[PDB]
């Protein structure tokens, strides 16, 4: 697993219980280098090559899967996403 | 509350996906940190 | 009033009951040449001379070029999502 | 399997809808303009 700098800033504004859930995800990612789509809500983002979103409550984790490499790029609340349009 | 279902919900989800992808594009040149480095 | 070619294409998808309400809108601004009327009308932010009229679940997109009202689009809310962003 | 949203969410969605409609209009920029008589054919 790799983590974009910004993902760390993103994680500062995440409630304790959701960070805990994210930690679990990363831990399971560290043991298996895979994400279980039967246990997690995982969706490929259309119009991009290797972007996926995982839904954790009201938060979406934005990940890039480059080959075998999993990169955690962002974690944002639903309300914060509505702001990323030019 | 305001009813929405359901084809419309999916369309809103697509927009939310694009917003996140765009948020992810802002990190394209970011330093990538290891599992060890992040805390 | 003027009508963009696309408006006609857009109208083939609109149901009877909405088409009746649009006709009443067209009929009124034909003699007044203004959309100001019990209309749910708003100016679209970020754009020049663009206006939206809500007709139930449909939105009519209008451009006012000086003193000319141009009906450009009429779309169901579900269809509008694809044009964003 | 049935969805419900708040008023603040509805309001944000109306803002999205205006912009989508604006972009929908931008697509018609090169369109022939028709009179009322011409539109009924």
UniProtKB/Swiss-Prot annotation, chain A:
InterPro entries: RelE/ParE_toxin (IPR007712), RelE/ParE_toxin_dom_sf (IPR035093), TA_system_RelE_toxin (IPR052747). It is an enzyme of class 3 (hydrolase). Transmembrane segments: none annotated. Keywords: Hydrolase, Nuclease, Toxin-antitoxin system. One of its GO terms (molecular function) is nuclease activity. SUPFAM superfamilies: RelE-like (SSF143011). It holds the Pfam family ParE_toxin. It comes from the Archaea. Its EC number is 3.1.-.-. Belongs to the RelE toxin family. Toxic component of a type II toxin-antitoxin (TA) system. Has RNase activity. Is very toxic upon expression in E.coli. Its toxic activity is probably neutralized by the cognate antitoxin RelB3. Forms heterodimers with RelB3 and possibly a heterotetramer RelE3-RelB3(2)-RelE3 from 2 heterodimers. The heterotetramer is probably not very stable in solution. This is Toxin RelE3. It comes from Methanocaldococcus jannaschii (strain ATCC 43067 / DSM 2661 / JAL-1 / JCM 10045 / NBRC 100440).
Swiss-Prot record, chain D:
It comes from the Archaea. Antitoxin component of a type II toxin-antitoxin (TA) system. Probably neutralizes the toxic activity of cognate toxin RelE. Forms heterodimers with RelE and possibly a heterotetramer RelE3-RelB3(2)-RelE3 from 2 heterodimers. The heterotetramer is probably not very stable in solution. The lineage of its organism: Archaea, Methanobacteriati, Methanobacteriota, Methanomada group, Methanococci. The chain holds residues 8 to 48 of 53 of the full protein. The keyword RNA-binding does not apply. The gene is relB3. Keywords: Toxin-antitoxin system. The keyword RNA-binding does not apply. Disulfide bonds: none annotated. This is Antitoxin RelB3.
């Amino acid at each position: 697993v790799l983590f974009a700098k910004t993902f760390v800033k993103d994680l500062k504004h995440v409630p304790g219980h959701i960070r805990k859930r994210i930690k679990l995800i990363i831990e399971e990612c560290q043991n298996s280098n895979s994400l279980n789509d039967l246990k997690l809500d995982i969706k490929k983002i259309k119009g991009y090559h290797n972007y996926y979103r995982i839904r954790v409550g009201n938060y979406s984790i934005g990940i890039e899967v480059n080959g075998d490499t999993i990169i955690f790029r962002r974690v944002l609340h639903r309300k914060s996403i509505y702001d990323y349009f030019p | 509350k305001f009813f929405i279902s359901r084809k419309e919900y999916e369309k809103i989800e697509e927009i939310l996906d694009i917003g996140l992808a765009k948020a992810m594009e802002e990190t394209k040149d970011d330093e990538l940190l290891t599992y060890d480095e992040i805390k």
